[PDB]
């Protein structure tokens, strides 16, 4: 949430990030919240995908 | 609920992504994956580029 | 031909969407320019209840009459 909202002293835009590494480090890379619709987008690595599948 | 949800996957198997957006179904397809006789004929698609690559 | 409206699929490749779509023009542009010129003239000129019954004056959208973006 902090990454997708930016630091309080340095607010960010709608769809952006402080850095490419900061956005790509976490599983989530994009979030959109409508009045009731939720949209999310992950870029999952193969090892993380396998671990999630096993879990 | 899963009965009223939607999931799309893009990988070496599935080359497309599906979005429902704001009541409009849109599929994104990268150009670097498949060509399929790429051309600029219809206006129903949207050309999207990169900031650095400056290409569709 | 007049019996019913034909489907667009047959003539879809005829042209493109918004082929003859032209932008609009502002209304009363000359009048707004005249008001702006008069106001500017007055501005740069400035910068540089009697007992009579009829003495009182007769006290009889979203458009900028002055024609200046506030």
Burial (CB count within 10 angstroms: exposed 0-12, middle 13-18, buried 19+), residue B52: exposed
Task: Note the resolution in Å, 1 decimal.
Answer: 4.2
How far apart CA A4 and CA A23 sit, in angstroms, is 8
Contacts with A, B 6-25, CB within 8 Å: 19-20, 22
For C3-22, b where at least 16 C-beta lie within 10 A, e where not — what string? Answer: eeeeeeeeeeeeeeeeeeee
How far apart CA B9 and CA B19 sit, in angstroms, is 11
How far apart CA C25 and CA C3 sit, in angstroms, is 38
How far apart CA B17 and CA A30 sit, in angstroms, is 14
The backbone torsions φ and ψ at residue A40, rounded to the nearest 5 degrees and listed phi first, read -140, 155
How far apart CA B2 and CA B42 sit, in angstroms, is 35
Please work out, in degrees rounded to the nearest 5, the angle formed at the alpha carbon of residue C36 by the alpha carbons of C33 and C42. 145
Q: Which chains are within 8 Å of A by 3+ CB pairs?
A: B
Q: How many CA atoms lie within 13 A of C11 on its CB side?
A: 7
User: Closest Cα of chain A to B41: distance in Å?
Assistant: 30
Nearest CA to C26 out of C36, C16, C17, C18 is that of C36
Output the 3-class SS for C14-53: HCCCCCCCCCCCCCCHHHHHHHHHHHHHHHHHHHCCCCCH
Contacts of C51 by beta carbon, 8 Å cutoff, 6+ apart: none
Cα end-to-end distance, chain A, whole Å: 25
How far apart CA B31 and CA B45 sit, in angstroms, is 13
Render A18-53 in DSSP notation, one character per residue.
Answer: S-HHHHHHSSEEEEEE-SS-EEEEE---HHHHHHHH
Deposited experimental method: cryo-EM
How far apart CA B4 and CA A46 sit, in angstroms, is 28
Q: Does A37 touch chain B (CB under 8 A)?
A: yes
Taking only Cα atoms into account, the Rg of chain B, rounded to an integer number of angstroms, comes to 14
Contacts of C42 by beta carbon, 8 Å cutoff, 6+ apart: none
How far apart CA C12 and CA C19 sit, in angstroms, is 13
- Contact (CB, 8 A) for A29 and A41: yes
Q: Which chains are within 8 Å of C by 3+ CB pairs?
A: none
User: Closest Cα of chain B to A40: distance in Å?
Assistant: 10
Please work out, in degrees rounded to the nearest 5, the angle formed at the alpha carbon of residue B49 by the alpha carbons of A28 and B39. 125
- Contact (CB, 8 A) for A11 and A4: no
Q: What token pair was written down for C46?
A: 């400035």
How far apart CA B34 and CA B12 sit, in angstroms, is 11
- Contact (CB, 8 A) for B48 and B42: no
């Amino acid at each position: 949430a902090s990454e997708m909202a930016g630091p309080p002293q340095m607010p960010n835009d709608f769809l952006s990030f402080q850095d490419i590494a900061t956005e790509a480090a976490h599983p989530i890379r994009l979030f959109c919240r409508y009045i009731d619709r939720i949209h999310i987008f992950f870029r999952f690595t193969a090892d993380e995908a396998r671990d999630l599948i096993q879990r | 609920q899963w009965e009223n949800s939607f999931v799309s996957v893009y990988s070496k198997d599935n080359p497309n992504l599906l979005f429902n957006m704001c009541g409009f179904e849109c599929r994104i397809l990268p150009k670097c994956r498949t060509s399929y006789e790429e051309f600029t004929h219809k206006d129903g698609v949207w050309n999207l580029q990169n900031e650095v690559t400056k290409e569709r | 031909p007049t019996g019913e409206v034909l489907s667009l699929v047959g003539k879809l490749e005829g042209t493109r969407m918004g082929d003859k779509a032209q932008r609009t023009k502002p209304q009363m542009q000359e009048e707004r320019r005249a008001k702006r010129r008069k106001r500017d003239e007055d501005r740069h000129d400035i910068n540089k209840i009697d007992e009579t019954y009829g003495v009182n004056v007769q006290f009889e959208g979203d458009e900028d009459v002055y024609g200046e973006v506030r």
